[PDB]
From Swiss-Prot, chain B:
Descriptive protein name: Spliceosome associated factor 3, U4/U6 recycling protein
Tissue-specificity statement: Ubiquitously expressed.
Modified residues (Phosphoserine): S124
Compartment(s): Nucleus, Nucleoplasm; Nucleus, Cajal body; Nucleus speckle; Cytoplasm
Amino acid sequence: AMGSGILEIERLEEQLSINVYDYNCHVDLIRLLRLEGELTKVRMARQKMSEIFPLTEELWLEWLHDEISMAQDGLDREHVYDLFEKAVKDYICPNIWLEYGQYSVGGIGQKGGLEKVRSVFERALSSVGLHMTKGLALWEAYREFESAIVEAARLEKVHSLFRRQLAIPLYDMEATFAEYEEWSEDPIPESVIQNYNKALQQLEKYKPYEEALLQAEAPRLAEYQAYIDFEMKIGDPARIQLIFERALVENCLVPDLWIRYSQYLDRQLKVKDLVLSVHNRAIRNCPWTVALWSRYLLAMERHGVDHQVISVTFEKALNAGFIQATDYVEIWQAYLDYLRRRVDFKQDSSKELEELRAAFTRALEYLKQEVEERFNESGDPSCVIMQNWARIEARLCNNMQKARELWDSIMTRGNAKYANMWLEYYNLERAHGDTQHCRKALHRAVQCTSDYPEHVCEVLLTMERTEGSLEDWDIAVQKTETRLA
Amino acid sequence: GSGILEIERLEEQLSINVYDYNCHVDLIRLLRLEGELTKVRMARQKMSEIFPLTEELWLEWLHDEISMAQDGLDREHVYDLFEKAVKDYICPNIWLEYGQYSVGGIGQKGGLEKVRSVFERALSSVGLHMTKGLALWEAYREFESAIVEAARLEKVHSLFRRQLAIPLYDMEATFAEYEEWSEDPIPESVIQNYNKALQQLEKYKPYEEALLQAEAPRLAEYQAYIDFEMKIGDPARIQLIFERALVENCLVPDLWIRYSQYLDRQLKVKDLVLSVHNRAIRNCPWTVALWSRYLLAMERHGVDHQVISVTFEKALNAGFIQATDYVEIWQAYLDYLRRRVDFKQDSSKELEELRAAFTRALEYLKQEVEERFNESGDPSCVIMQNWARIEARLCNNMQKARELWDSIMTRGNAKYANMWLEYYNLERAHGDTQHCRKALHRAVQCTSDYPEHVCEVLLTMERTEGSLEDWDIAVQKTETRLA
């Protein structure tokens, strides 16, 4: 039908105008914009999708090819580089690295672009150079490049690439050892023979695992978990990054896998940029699991990420949309713990303390409104945000009145039927109130508790026996008697 | 010569176990058969100081002293003996005998008033007694009638008028007797009182017959009767029903608690309640609770200190059958000793008495109770806890509370989340965060029943106030433990 593309593009653009988080809508919109030839609009649509989602290697590769096969300038070259730089972040991508290398080969002649090629291949190798099946292509392409240059019969570059590859367990390395012997008229030194042979021993070691992947269907999660384990016991940080990544490209929706990888980096070789990177990638691949946002905020805090960045990240976390109210309480509590750990409490007043209190009010209102309106629940039925606030105010801020207010609020939402709650507040008054307030609290407790009144009773008697007048003890015995009768 | 040796034997068995009641009645039996008058009398004295004597034993002693009384000094001493006799239980016969014997003193010693004293007091005790008081009214009017002088008769008239205003058995018979006796007309005012008395007598009939139809001790019947009289709420009549119930049921400790409490909460009289408490620990000295109640009474009514101390010592020397009971009474005494301390001075005589009493209690439990029970008595170091709570909160002394908690935690109390948290909360209140962290770390390591709860508390504490580092170490400990 005539002009159907125009109308369907309008339709999809409007459907995205309401629900921006529609992946298939972006994919469709982009293919139709390509068929109509609206090039700049394809570029924009692609940019918005890539800023919302991780793109697979095929989508990244399509966009890269379109920008490359359309580039007529040196500035276009720098912009293409920028696009590659953005493309490598999402997942492990051997082909993207290959294309980046070869496309960068065009950059020679321009002064600073021999090193540019070597940088691209070097980072390519550092990333996937160990890849059992796809690294070989990168080693080979890098060597083809150095061979096509090899100025003045200076084969130290090609030699080095051979010697670095041969010490590494990838497929058909025997073939590379072959081409090397037939190439280097000099002997292949015993360091290279020894390392080559232990490497071949690493191929034979790993064969059953790789063939487990080959046979398996779908995303092959089980096989990746077995390989993850095996490599994690063998304990090479490089090789466990590699298998975590290889498993993650195929299993990137599995949050617990992100947590395993995240946790290994986060706790064991905590290099800032790498863990912050992997956390960000986790919250882009599985934004529905608040745990990922929590560990990410904890990671940022641990690594001294600037204040404003953490705040903005929290805002993204709020907006991610979780399926349980306990999750909104959870992320709010994470943010508030961060805010509290920001305050010095030994000064009359603070800028940071006021931000903490303000964030508490905001958190409570947000649970009153957004979470209730979307769930018909409070998220914390037992007012834990308020509890933590009262604790802070009483124990750290000398502000006992606010704590009393907050516990008023806590008890009014039906928490007064619970002995545990009464004892939580009592312990607060005992900690930072006075004996009068503890008495009031425990009396009220004796007359409100529904689950375990005898427990509050015995605490009351204990308190008066320890500290109250004989009149006080007598009143206590009467209340408890009348209550438990 | 078997009597000689059997007496010697009983004296030996009393030399070992002085709290053998039947041994005393037997010893006295034999000493009487032997004519050892002096030894009979102080066998009677020692027994009467150990136990309450029933009405009959008191009557034997009284009859013997009376039929052996040969001068006026014996008369006054017999009076003293009666004075001691009435204290133990309710004793209508003894009150009657006390009156009749007091009649012998009329001529001499200005003691015509004495007879009226004895009979008035006899009335105050059992004058309201539904079945046995009539005997006492009758005897009182007999004496007054026989010493009527010039027919003034206002003593006999008044006595009749007082009996008729009270519901006693077959007063209808005395109402008639009075009319026949009275030259004048029974007044309008006593007539209404007699008729109201008829009302309440017919009211009480099914309860009195409840006692009669039932076999003794009619505890239930007595408990039901006590219930009714207490619902009517007359203090005289419910004291009376409590005493009548107790004479047959003096071994029922819960009954002494009921009566003791009724007076404690409601009557609000020192002499009455303290009497009932003393009599309670004499009848059932084996229920530590009675001693507790009693000490509390003494504290309430401002009883002098040394009396309270001595009563406590008696309490310790009583024999209880449970390790927990010695903790209970020690706690009673220690709470008492604490309520004597003005905690707003740096040091005190009363505070040092408290502390020294604490050391005494811990040592006494480590020694007497452990060696006699093969137990700690206090398994959960309750006395030690209370000492810690006091030292921390009421004195400025936090160090001692920490020590006391070493001792508390070292006998297997370290497996328990409650204990760990008790120490924690104490440390939270009067220690510092450092010690709370230390405490809760060790708590997650040691707790066996509810380690997850302790883990919660740790995480909550570090979230509320600890560094990020502290939060991470906490999560590590927790996860490692609950793994």
